[PDB]
Amino acid sequence: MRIILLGAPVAGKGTQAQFIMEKYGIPQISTGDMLRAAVKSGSELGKQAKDIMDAGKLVTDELVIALVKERIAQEDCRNGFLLDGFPRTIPQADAMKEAGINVDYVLEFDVPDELIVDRIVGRRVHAPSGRVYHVKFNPPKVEGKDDVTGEELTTRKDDQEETVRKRLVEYHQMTAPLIGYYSKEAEAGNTKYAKVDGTKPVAEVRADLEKILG
Numbered sequence: 001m002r003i004i005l006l007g008a009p010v011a012g013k014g015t016q017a018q019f020i021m022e023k024y025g026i027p028q029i030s031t032g033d034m035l036r037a038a039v040k041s042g043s044e045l046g047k048q049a050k051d052i053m054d055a056g057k058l059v060t061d062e063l064v065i066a067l068v069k070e071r072i073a074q075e076d077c078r079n080g081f082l083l084d085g086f087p088r089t090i091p092q093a094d095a096m097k098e099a100g101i102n103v104d105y106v107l108e109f110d111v112p113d114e115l116i117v118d119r120i121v122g123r124r125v126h127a128p129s130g131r132v133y134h135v136k137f138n139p140p141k142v143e144g145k146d147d148v149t150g151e152e153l154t155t156r157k158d159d160q161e162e163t164v165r166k167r168l169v170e171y172h173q174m175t176a177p178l179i180g181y182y183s184k185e186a187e188a189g190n191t192k193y194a195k196v197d198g199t200k201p202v203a204e205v206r207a208d209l210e211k212i213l214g
């Protein structure tokens with residue numbers, strides 16, 4: 001099963017990708033996790049994104065498509081995988097198409113723009129794994145620590161109010177056209193398209209997703 005998760009900044013894609021991965025066994029391929037990991041380890045494919053992500057801007061399609069094709073080539077992606085935050089532009093969606101990467105579901109996370117800033121202020125991460133928390137809406141079991149490793153939780157560098165306003169603008173100019181793109185894909189018969197209300201509680205969104213997927 002191959003799934004794309006499409007949606008605004010902090011719509012809860014990452015949170016739901018952890019559930020889909022543990023319950024359907026397909027690996028989560030998050031381009032922001034991979035890009036933050038590259039920037040941190042000084043990896044030649046990807047360490048260039050540092051200043052771009054910092055600024056709230058989209059990294060160049062040629063860079064991110066390179067990253068995705070290497071990852072998708074690993075033997076764990078043979079029985080499906082889950083794309084979280086990829087594609088992000090029509091170039092990146094075209095490129096998966098030319099490459100013969102067709103997906104089964106495109107799931108759009110709808111959240112109003114007004115909710116974005118307060119999700120940013122209480123988000124905390126386990127950077128080694130892409131586990132994400134919210135101090136109010138989905139807190140760790142012990143305050144400040146990752147549930148699985150007990151390691152200390154951090155804030156993302158780019159979770160500032162003005163960085164997220166820029167992320168939103170770029171989302172509206174470049175990514176949001178992908179809703180029309182895969183709706184058109186779905187009409188053609190190439191994929192299934194489903195919309196979920198991202199303002200619901202985490203457990204509620206999760207259960208909506210179990211309904212669509214099996």
Ligand SMILES: Nc1ncnc2c1ncn2[C@@H]1O[C@H](COP(=O)(O)OP(=O)(O)OP(=O)(O)OP(=O)(O)OP(=O)(O)OC[C@H]2O[C@@H](n3cnc4c(N)ncnc43)[C@H](O)[C@@H]2O)[C@@H](O)[C@H]1O
Nearest residue numbers: 009010011012013014015031032053059085123133134202
């Ligand atoms: N393909 C690409 N092309 C180019 N550049 C790229 C790229 N990919 C990455 N980059 C770059 O890297 C940068 C960062 O992008 P990136 O990290 O890739 O962005 P994203 O995939 O859109 O996801 P976000 O991190 O914004 O949030 P999310 O929807 O996964 O929600 P989350 O579950 O964390 O949670 C949101 C918060 O609220 C929470 N929450 C989750 N669900 C709920 C709920 N039900 N109710 C309330 N709170 C909730 C969480 O606890 C958390 O605290 C980009 O700007 C760009 O520079």
